[PDB]
């Protein structure tokens, strides 16, 4: 149709989301409490095997066997199909070879700022 | 009565039941179970009948012969009893089941259509369906005998 | 800071993975055309939390009430994979599990 | 379709109580307390108010034959 | 059939509603529509044949 | 005659047809093939003797 | 054909399409797929006959079925959160279809009921002094749903002789009332 | 016909028509004391 | 005694019919389609079990232990594996009059032992 209206309509949401809100859409009876403002790569896990890519699932604050998840590629023919594992050492830990399991968009409280970081390709790993 | 039927079932399951002359083992087991449950129905009906006072209006109408029978009183007060389809207990219309609510191969009284409640107590859903089956048999008989008898 | 802020928007509400910038936006799209332009104009976001517990989407004058379904079938570890380190420097933020379905 | 005038059983007037009954119900009375407030003490008149379905309100959703 | 004759399977129950289907408005109107569309295509065949036998075009609307 | 014969009442045909004839008409002439299609467990002679009359009737 | 002995046949709408080696986890996969509203739609019936190794899948029309509550080990999948979202049905547009899509409810046809072990009420799922089943798979939403439109008007129909309930179900249809609101036109 | 087929035929016949004891057309008989 | 199975020709794969060789006075199995012959090894041509003394344990399959609609018991442990639970069911097969007999199957996976009390 036209761009001089699209520029202002896209900025219009960027401006209206920051106004004062005190009412619902269907029945304006519910008062708001707070607001949650908004590449990526997520390793899916199988619910039976129950996969521990992080130390959270292991119920751990930090890595008791590492200090940096150096997510490095499995090979040269697999950029999206890397090999994520929590091993700072060349130790034969759980080698979770994140196969290519090729919208699931992710965001965060980035200091109450307007951005996005939608995911690129749902990979899923197993115990190799 | 239900414990008696359970005992007969356990006997049949253990091959501790031998058939009587003129019947197969299935028919003998069915005869034993039906005898137990008919005895239960009659005993409970007698209990209800003796419980009635001289002021009871069911008893008044039955005594005068105006309407009703002692079996009706038993079904209203004591127990509705066994529901039969074609003169036998409720058939296994599912695969070795009368309803999906029972286990397979369940020849117990409640599985095969014994209404252990009265009409005042109220029927359970399976008793309700089995009683509807038994009553459907009477409706079909009433609606099908007429043409042949009139002819 | 580290809280789950995952949402799953349908095809007709696909927001841009990057902030709106005049050097990344262009005019290419036009009842038939009315659903077409709404992909790159209405689609930055503020997920309001109400008092009843539910959330809603605010991308303009219209409000889409969303429901933060919490799924134990897709427990993927969501991470900001930016091309910088060895192979996509996945930063550990929040594991995606709960998916919020927006709709009119 | 509309609240009867009299109670079918006794002949007590209930026609003037439907609107008051509804007003008491929106005033957060229970149906029993509302019926007590209107003076319907026999269960026949309580039957009249408690079992009434105001269908006339639905018949008034249709435009009349003449404007 | 052999499993039934050997007693290894039960005979099927004619009355089991798992063995039955309810022919509703849609599948019934479909039966009608198949018959009626076939008759219509037949009538179109005769009408078009009597024209092309004369070696000239015909109007499908008629 | 001797045993129980299996027949097949096909549509548009006003006479019973032995099942073995139907199987051969579909391209399965060897009796082994037909019983491979009918009897899936060759360790079961009961099924075998009950199908045998149909084979004996169609040779 | 030598493989058909131990294998399980698979019929789809009556057509024998193939065979399988582990029917149990096939049925688990297919039930998971139907309960997730994946490729299998809700009205598809999937019966595993175990003693005879057929797995019959039906998608055709005319199959009368009814909804039932799926049962976990010995628990309903209908948790209190579903009832909570159903209570505010008019605000959050959480409807029946969301209940079916959650894998909490399932449509079971007459032929799949043969393979189902029903609980009449969640009280049947309680552990008892002598367990009747202890391996239920579904539960009734309410047994009174076995009745139709005219029998659902009888009060206390389980305290009547069944012919009486049939005669009322016939006589509710000759009863006067307001057959429709727009009767004036 | 060959001998073995003849043995099979007479087997199938003897097992049906060979009346060892009893009267034809009488399938079953029940003996009892009449209480009435 | 035991039943007798059908045996097929090695050339035409048709069933071999029984025949007697007078010259050696010996049983043969010969094809009436091709000209194949074979020396029998059973000497029995036909077997009819009128009593129908069939071991229904052979008809049972362990997969039935996966049936949620069958009853389970803890009172009859498995003699092959020691599992406590076991499903039980009746014959439900035609030509079996004394069919109140119970057949048990072990619910342990990959054991599948079947028996009868
Ligand atoms: Zn009154
Ligand atoms: Zn040969
Ligand atoms: Zn075992």
PDB file of C-alpha atoms in Angstrom, chain C:
ATOM      1  CA  UNK C   1      17.134 -10.978  35.114  1.00  0.00           C
ATOM      2  CA  UNK C   2      17.158 -14.745  34.616  1.00  0.00           C
ATOM      3  CA  UNK C   3      13.451 -15.462  34.270  1.00  0.00           C
ATOM      4  CA  UNK C   4      11.590 -17.426  31.614  1.00  0.00           C
ATOM      5  CA  UNK C   5      10.330 -14.980  28.997  1.00  0.00           C
ATOM      6  CA  UNK C   6       9.413 -17.509  26.308  1.00  0.00           C
ATOM      7  CA  UNK C   7       6.416 -16.978  24.015  1.00  0.00           C
ATOM      8  CA  UNK C   8       5.192 -18.859  20.934  1.00  0.00           C
ATOM      9  CA  UNK C   9       3.394 -16.584  18.434  1.00  0.00           C
ATOM     10  CA  UNK C  10       1.494 -17.987  15.433  1.00  0.00           C
ATOM     11  CA  UNK C  11       2.239 -17.325  11.774  1.00  0.00           C
ATOM     12  CA  UNK C  12       0.036 -14.233  11.432  1.00  0.00           C
ATOM     13  CA  UNK C  13       1.771 -12.554  14.407  1.00  0.00           C
ATOM     14  CA  UNK C  14       5.437 -13.229  13.594  1.00  0.00           C
ATOM     15  CA  UNK C  15       7.339 -10.299  15.141  1.00  0.00           C
ATOM     16  CA  UNK C  16      10.766  -9.302  13.833  1.00  0.00           C
ATOM     17  CA  UNK C  17      13.789 -11.014  15.443  1.00  0.00           C
ATOM     18  CA  UNK C  18      15.584  -7.667  15.495  1.00  0.00           C
ATOM     19  CA  UNK C  19      14.518  -4.204  16.662  1.00  0.00           C
ATOM     20  CA  UNK C  20      12.711  -2.054  14.144  1.00  0.00           C
ATOM     21  CA  UNK C  21      15.297   0.049  12.320  1.00  0.00           C
ATOM     22  CA  UNK C  22      14.685   2.235   9.248  1.00  0.00           C
ATOM     23  CA  UNK C  23      17.759   0.753   7.547  1.00  0.00           C
ATOM     24  CA  UNK C  24      16.411  -2.808   7.911  1.00  0.00           C
ATOM     25  CA  UNK C  25      12.800  -2.146   6.872  1.00  0.00           C
ATOM     26  CA  UNK C  26      11.379  -1.856   3.362  1.00  0.00           C
ATOM     27  CA  UNK C  27       8.034  -1.792   1.557  1.00  0.00           C
ATOM     28  CA  UNK C  28       7.287  -5.020  -0.265  1.00  0.00           C
ATOM     29  CA  UNK C  29       3.800  -6.098   0.840  1.00  0.00           C
ATOM     30  CA  UNK C  30       0.459  -4.435   0.020  1.00  0.00           C
ATOM     31  CA  UNK C  31     -10.078  -8.480   2.593  1.00  0.00           C
ATOM     32  CA  UNK C  32      -7.422 -10.250   0.528  1.00  0.00           C
ATOM     33  CA  UNK C  33      -4.592  -7.794   1.153  1.00  0.00           C
ATOM     34  CA  UNK C  34      -5.846  -6.743   4.582  1.00  0.00           C
ATOM     35  CA  UNK C  35      -4.271  -9.734   6.352  1.00  0.00           C
ATOM     36  CA  UNK C  36      -1.046  -9.341   4.344  1.00  0.00           C
ATOM     37  CA  UNK C  37       0.281  -5.967   5.530  1.00  0.00           C
ATOM     38  CA  UNK C  38      -0.447  -6.814   9.179  1.00  0.00           C
ATOM     39  CA  UNK C  39       2.573  -9.148   9.204  1.00  0.00           C
ATOM     40  CA  UNK C  40       5.252  -6.424   9.005  1.00  0.00           C
ATOM     41  CA  UNK C  41       3.480  -3.424  10.551  1.00  0.00           C
ATOM     42  CA  UNK C  42       1.748  -4.671  13.706  1.00  0.00           C
ATOM     43  CA  UNK C  43       4.468  -7.257  14.250  1.00  0.00           C
ATOM     44  CA  UNK C  44       8.737  -3.854  20.501  1.00  0.00           C
ATOM     45  CA  UNK C  45       6.605  -6.102  22.725  1.00  0.00           C
ATOM     46  CA  UNK C  46       5.445  -5.689  26.329  1.00  0.00           C
ATOM     47  CA  UNK C  47       3.995  -8.785  28.025  1.00  0.00           C
ATOM     48  CA  UNK C  48       1.775  -7.252  30.693  1.00  0.00           C
ATOM     49  CA  UNK C  49       1.208  -9.173  33.914  1.00  0.00           C
ATOM     50  CA  UNK C  50      -2.282  -8.644  35.314  1.00  0.00           C
ATOM     51  CA  UNK C  51      -3.627  -9.357  38.803  1.00  0.00           C
ATOM     52  CA  UNK C  52      -5.556 -12.504  37.864  1.00  0.00           C
ATOM     53  CA  UNK C  53      -2.215 -14.101  36.909  1.00  0.00           C
ATOM     54  CA  UNK C  54      -2.687 -14.239  33.138  1.00  0.00           C
ATOM     55  CA  UNK C  55      -0.722 -12.205  30.593  1.00  0.00           C
ATOM     56  CA  UNK C  56      -1.564 -10.259  27.448  1.00  0.00           C
ATOM     57  CA  UNK C  57       0.264  -8.989  24.374  1.00  0.00           C
ATOM     58  CA  UNK C  58       0.560  -5.256  23.644  1.00  0.00           C
ATOM     59  CA  UNK C  59       1.693  -4.427  20.120  1.00  0.00           C
ATOM     60  CA  UNK C  60      -0.568  -1.418  19.537  1.00  0.00           C
ATOM     61  CA  UNK C  61      -4.223  -0.525  20.084  1.00  0.00           C
ATOM     62  CA  UNK C  62      -5.330  -4.176  20.075  1.00  0.00           C
ATOM     63  CA  UNK C  63      -4.759  -6.530  23.022  1.00  0.00           C
ATOM     64  CA  UNK C  64      -4.280 -10.287  22.578  1.00  0.00           C
ATOM     65  CA  UNK C  65      -4.843 -12.207  25.804  1.00  0.00           C
ATOM     66  CA  UNK C  66      -2.205 -14.938  26.086  1.00  0.00           C
ATOM     67  CA  UNK C  67      -2.031 -18.052  28.269  1.00  0.00           C
ATOM     68  CA  UNK C  68       1.377 -19.198  29.488  1.00  0.00           C
ATOM     69  CA  UNK C  69       0.974 -22.967  28.946  1.00  0.00           C
ATOM     70  CA  UNK C  70       3.799 -24.857  30.743  1.00  0.00           C
ATOM     71  CA  UNK C  71       4.923 -27.750  28.543  1.00  0.00           C
ATOM     72  CA  UNK C  72       6.849 -30.834  29.614  1.00  0.00           C
ATOM     73  CA  UNK C  73       7.333 -32.174  26.099  1.00  0.00           C
ATOM     74  CA  UNK C  74       9.637 -29.527  24.634  1.00  0.00           C
ATOM     75  CA  UNK C  75      12.181 -28.812  27.376  1.00  0.00           C
ATOM     76  CA  UNK C  76      14.763 -27.209  25.084  1.00  0.00           C
ATOM     77  CA  UNK C  77      17.585 -25.094  26.508  1.00  0.00           C
ATOM     78  CA  UNK C  78      16.978 -21.670  24.922  1.00  0.00           C
ATOM     79  CA  UNK C  79      20.171 -19.653  24.494  1.00  0.00           C
ATOM     80  CA  UNK C  80      21.420 -16.545  22.681  1.00  0.00           C
ATOM     81  CA  UNK C  81      23.624 -18.123  20.028  1.00  0.00           C
ATOM     82  CA  UNK C  82      25.488 -15.188  18.525  1.00  0.00           C
ATOM     83  CA  UNK C  83      28.289 -15.790  16.025  1.00  0.00           C
ATOM     84  CA  UNK C  84      31.355 -14.611  17.957  1.00  0.00           C
ATOM     85  CA  UNK C  85      33.100 -17.396  19.872  1.00  0.00           C
ATOM     86  CA  UNK C  86      33.953 -20.836  18.448  1.00  0.00           C
ATOM     87  CA  UNK C  87      30.601 -21.923  17.009  1.00  0.00           C
ATOM     88  CA  UNK C  88      27.652 -19.802  18.199  1.00  0.00           C
ATOM     89  CA  UNK C  89      28.467 -18.491  21.672  1.00  0.00           C
ATOM     90  CA  UNK C  90      25.343 -19.786  23.382  1.00  0.00           C
ATOM     91  CA  UNK C  91      24.748 -17.643  26.452  1.00  0.00           C
ATOM     92  CA  UNK C  92      22.986 -19.405  29.318  1.00  0.00           C
ATOM     93  CA  UNK C  93      19.689 -17.582  29.964  1.00  0.00           C
ATOM     94  CA  UNK C  94      16.448 -19.547  30.392  1.00  0.00           C
ATOM     95  CA  UNK C  95      15.421 -23.049  29.320  1.00  0.00           C
ATOM     96  CA  UNK C  96      12.343 -22.829  27.125  1.00  0.00           C
ATOM     97  CA  UNK C  97       9.416 -24.864  28.453  1.00  0.00           C
ATOM     98  CA  UNK C  98       6.354 -22.671  28.924  1.00  0.00           C
ATOM     99  CA  UNK C  99       4.849 -21.509  25.634  1.00  0.00           C
ATOM    100  CA  UNK C 100       2.441 -18.607  25.513  1.00  0.00           C
ATOM    101  CA  UNK C 101      -0.138 -18.794  22.719  1.00  0.00           C
ATOM    102  CA  UNK C 102      -1.314 -15.378  21.473  1.00  0.00           C
ATOM    103  CA  UNK C 103      -4.575 -15.050  19.542  1.00  0.00           C
ATOM    104  CA  UNK C 104      -7.396 -12.687  18.640  1.00  0.00           C
TER     105      UNK C 104
END
